[PDB]
Each structure stands twice: as C-alpha cells, then as structure tokens.
Structure 1
Amino acid sequence: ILGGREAEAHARPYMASVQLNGAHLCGGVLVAEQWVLSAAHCLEDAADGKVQVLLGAHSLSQPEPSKRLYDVLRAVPHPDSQPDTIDHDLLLLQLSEKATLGPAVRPLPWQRVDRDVAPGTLCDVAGWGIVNHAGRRPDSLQHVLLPVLDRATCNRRTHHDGAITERLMCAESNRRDSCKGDSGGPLVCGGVLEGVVTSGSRVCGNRKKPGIYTRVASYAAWIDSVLA
C-alpha cells in the first residue's frame, strides 16, 4: 500500500495473507468459514513450494494469539482467467479445515447485488504489499482510503485505454494507491466487500494509471456456485 497508514491491529478480521514458503505473495479475504477469496495469478511460479493462508494476523513475523495457518485443500480459479488479461481475476481457496472464528478472524459479507459503487465513494484497501517504489515489504498490515473513480475516466487512452470492463472497477491512484503484494486483497465500501485487488502487473502511485479492482458482485453467481 503506497501512501498508507499502519492499520489498527485485528480491526479487519477478514484480512488473509496468501503465502508461499513462509513469504507473503498476496492478500486474501475470508468470505466463508472455509473459503478465502483472492486474485487468479497469485499462485503463478509457486509450483514446488508450501502454499498456506495466514489468518488472524497483523504482524507477519511476530507471534500473535489470533495468528493461525491453513493448508489449501482446493484452489478454484475462475474458468475464464488467463495471465494475459486482467479479466476474471478471481481465485477461491478452500482451507484444509474451517477457520477458528473470533474477534480477529471473521468472514466479510461480500456484495451479492450487481450495481456499481458510485464514483467518489471512499473505499478501504488493506494489505502487506510494498509501501514504497524501492519495494519495502511491510511487516504489519497497512491500509489506505481511496475514492472510487468513474469508469469512463479510467478507460481514457491516457489511463487504462478501454481495459476497464463492467466487471472491473477503479479507484484513485495519486501517490496513495494499491501495489505489488496487495493483489487479491479486499476493497471495502460501507463495511461490504466490493472489489478484489487485481494480480496483473501494473504501474503504482501514478494518478493517470488508476488502481484496478475486480467487482465481486459481478462474479456473485460463480462464488455462490463454488462455495455451495
């Protein structure tokens, strides 16, 4: 998270850290007792390595009572997801067992009505992604409040030149933005999950290249299908 603040410990109990060989890769969001929603291309180049989902965390390294690790029993990517496109950038991870729920571990209600978040709405994006262009990896959870950007502006040739479909959404990226590692992380508006940070490589912190987030409501039927 570029231009953010360290988040209040365990204030976002839905926050998950998708890790490979005990190293953070992507953010994730607890949507059910045994399901974590993330971005499609997070497990890319993972291959030979231990994939695990860290729950109840604030510091990635320090001991915390709430901190628990889960094996991934099943990894369900969206059927139409491909590394060449930023489209259908969703991944549903089934944990080995149901999450031990508590004040620091709680699933987030996600948007089940396909209606765009009104431009200018302030949304909260959190994660353990890089905090500066050099690439500083933060130990503790960071977060930033960003206003939702009008798709028309976002699709300008100077911006994402039409790449932003009706299934995607934008947020402002003027210094304060999401970045490498924030992928698969949640975009929350009015305490409801609205978007999922894309896992597609992009330029961060430049205002003319807005942050891209997958609209969960746009994939509500698929998510329901998998979870059931």
Structure 2
Amino acid sequence: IIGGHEVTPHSRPYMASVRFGGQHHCGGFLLRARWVVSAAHCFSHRDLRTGLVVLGAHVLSTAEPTQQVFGIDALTTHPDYHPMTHANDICLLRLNGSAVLGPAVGLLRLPGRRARPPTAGTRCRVAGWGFVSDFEELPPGLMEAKVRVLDPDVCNSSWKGHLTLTMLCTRSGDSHRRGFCSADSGGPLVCRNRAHGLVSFSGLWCGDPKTPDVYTQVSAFVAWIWDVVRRSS
C-alpha cells in the first residue's frame, strides 16, 4: 500500500493474508467462517496445497497468538476470469475449517443485491501487507490508505478503454500517490462499511495518477458469490 498508514494492530479483522511458499502473496477478506474472497489472478500457476490463508494477523513475519492459519479445501475462481483482459478477477476460497470469531478474526459484509457502485468522490479505504513503494519495500504490518472513487469515464480514458462495466477506480484525495501496490490483490476496497471493490490491477508504478487503481466492482458479483457459498453448504 502506497500513501497509507499502519493500522491499529487487529483493527481490520476481516483481512486475510494468502501465502505461498512461506511468503505473503495476496490479500483477501473473511466473508463467512469458512469463506474468503480474493482476486482470481493470485492463484494463477500455483499449487493450492503450497498455500495457506492467515487470519488474525498484523505482523505477518511474527507468529502471533491472534493468528489462525487455514488451508484451501476448494478454490472457486470466477468462470469468466480472463487473463489479457483481467475481467471477473474474483474467486472464493473454502477453508479446511471454520475460523473462530474473535476481536482479531472477523467478517466483512458485501453490498446488497440492490446495489449500484459508489459514486465518484466517495471516501473508501484499502488495506494490505504488500509493498509500500516502487522499491520492493515491505510494510511494518497491515497498512491502509484513504482513497476516493474516480469517475469511470475518466478512468477508462487513462486506461485507453480497457475497462469493463464490472471494474471501478480510485484516486488519492490529494496530490500524493495513495492506493495499492504489489501483493495487495484480492484485498477489499471498503466503502460505507461494505466490500465495494477488490484490488485487481494498476499501472507499472504504484499509485501513479496516469494509471489509476482498478478494482473488481463487488456488487456486480454478490449474486454469484452467494450461489457458490450455498452450493458448498
């Protein structure tokens, strides 16, 4: 996360750390005790059994008592996720067990089915354990940045018309570079206490205004998410 601050340890309990080969790879969120929502691209060319979902963490490197580590029993990627286009960059993860709810391991709510994406200007927040700059610099723990929803017609121009109706953008509330970076994918864009977006792609350099931060418009997927969840009891 660029242009962000470190969060109060355990102040965002829904945050999941998807890790492959010891190293933290992506972000995600706890939907239900057994379910985690993430970016479909995180699992591309990975063997699931090399992966763990870590909940209740702040300093990922430290083995905290608050931490709860689970395996991926099953991964449901959006059937229509397209590499090259990056559309439908969403997936669901069924853990090998249910997470024990506590003050450090908690749920995040999706918008209703009756939901349009947040308006251009809306104050939103993006958390993650990914890089803090374009120099591979690591955060001291879970970081968050305060962002504001950017007009899609504006975002689509910057992106040379590569944006689909199921994507949504952010921009910093000021002149500084604020947003997501590498290893922040899958993590949620919280708007009005609901997961409105999910960290998908950005340009080359982090928070660069010329290439605004693109997210998956969660509301457009709510129906699918539940379908999958009720499918697997």
Measured against the shorter chain, the TM-score band is over 0.9
Q: Per the alignment, do residues 119 and 48 of structure 1 end up closer, same or farther by CA in structure 2, a change over 3 Å counting?
A: closer
Q: Per the alignment, do residues 45 and 185 of structure 1 end up closer, same or farther by CA in structure 2, a change over 3 Å counting?
A: same
Aligned counterparts of 1:191 and 1:96: Cα–Cα separation in 2:
28
Report the aligned-residue RMSD: 1.5
Asked whether the equivalents of residues 201 and 215 of structure 2 are also in contact (C-alpha less than 8 Å), the reply is no
1:201 deviates by 6.9
Q: Per the alignment, do residues 137 and 114 of structure 1 end up closer, same or farther by CA in structure 2, a change over 3 Å counting?
A: same
Q: Partner residue of 2:164?
A: 165
Secondary structure of 1:144's counterpart equals strand
| Structure 2 counterparts to residues 8-23 of structure 1, below 5 A | 8-23=8-23
1:137 deviates by 2.2
1:7 deviates by 1.0
Deviates more, 1:171-180 or 1:193-202: 193-202
Asked whether the equivalents of residues 185 and 198 of structure 2 are also in contact (C-alpha less than 8 Å), the reply is yes
Asked whether the equivalents of residues 202 and 211 of structure 2 are also in contact (C-alpha less than 8 Å), the reply is no
Q: Partner residue of 1:96?
A: 96
Deviates more, 1:191-200 or 1:89-98: 191-200
Q: Partner residue of 2:29?
A: 29
Q: Deviations over 1:84-138 (max 9, x none)?
A: 2210000100000111111111110111233020111110000011101111122
Q: Partner residue of 1:130?
A: 131
Query: Aligned partner of 2:169: which letter?
Result: C
Q: When the two structures are superposed, what TM-score results if normalisation uses the length of structure 2?
A: 0.92
| Structure 2 counterparts to residues 168-179 of structure 1, below 5 A | 168-172=167-171, 174-179=176-181
Asked whether the equivalents of residues 41 and 200 of structure 1 are also in contact (C-alpha less than 8 Å), the reply is no
Secondary structure of 2:190's counterpart equals strand
Q: Partner residue of 2:73?
A: 73
Aligned counterparts of 2:89 and 2:184: Cα–Cα separation in 1:
14
Secondary structure of 1:204's counterpart equals coil
Asked whether the equivalents of residues 60 and 139 of structure 1 are also in contact (C-alpha less than 8 Å), the reply is no
Q: Partner residue of 1:52?
A: 52
1:205 deviates by 2.1
Asked whether the equivalents of residues 133 and 181 of structure 2 are also in contact (C-alpha less than 8 Å), the reply is no
Q: When the two structures are superposed, what TM-score results if normalisation uses the length of structure 1?
A: 0.94
Matched, 1:196 2:198: yes
Query: Aligned partner of 1:165: which letter?
Result: T
Secondary structure of 2:2's counterpart equals coil
Q: Which residue of 192, 209, 212 maps to 1:210?
A: 212
Gaps of 5+ in 1: none
